[PDB]
Amino acid sequence: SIPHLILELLKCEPDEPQVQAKIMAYLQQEKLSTFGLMCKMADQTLFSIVEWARSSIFFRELKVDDQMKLLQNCWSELLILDHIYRQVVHGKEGSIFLVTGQQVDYSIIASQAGATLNNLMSHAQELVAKLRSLQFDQREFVCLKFLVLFSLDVKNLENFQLVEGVQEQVNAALLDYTMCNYPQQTEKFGQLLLRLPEIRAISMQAEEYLYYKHLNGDVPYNNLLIEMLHA
């Protein structure tokens, strides 16, 4: 069984085919290297992440200033978690599955990148491998999305009451869920949570790299990614 709270979280998930077709159609309607393409994917996915958050349970109760503070804190972690889960579900050996449904060979991306991006990509695929081995599932994924979004490290929130509540109760429901549905993995809950600091680290390194690439003139023109990089 799935705890009531997690059932409520699942109801807020986007229609994946609709989002997939939207981004593919936008990029189709749109002189771009593979790196530029990845930036465009990130930018378009951020619009979908904001739309998802805005309409989600609990988040929709927050005033816009609180909503902004939370998203400014975690946007890159949500992008990376989204990517990681997509590889867990749809990915395979030596290929990368994109939000458009496009599958690209890993070397097509990696051979064209320098050390920093290669390291980040490699670290991301290690998380993919680890979460595979844990049998990371959709219920756990949506829980982690909410734990990433409702961070206790965000200062000056007006409604910290609600944010701490969500963090506490999603934690409780996730533990209940993993203890129930994966009893043979007695430490699954702890192993899932250990991935959050790793995602934070990768996300911060990714932001620093993209910030450098923007200063260097390598990030294609966009609206949202650049604004979030300055968040």
């Binding site: 739309e51 805005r54 816009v64 909503q67 902004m68 503070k69 998203l71 604004e227 979030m228 300055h230």
Partner: peptide
């Protein structure tokens, strides 16, 4: 932090 575009996307 102030960010006119993010604010707009959340409000619309």
């Amino acid at each position: 932090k102030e960010n006119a575009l993010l604010r707009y996307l959340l409000d619309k």
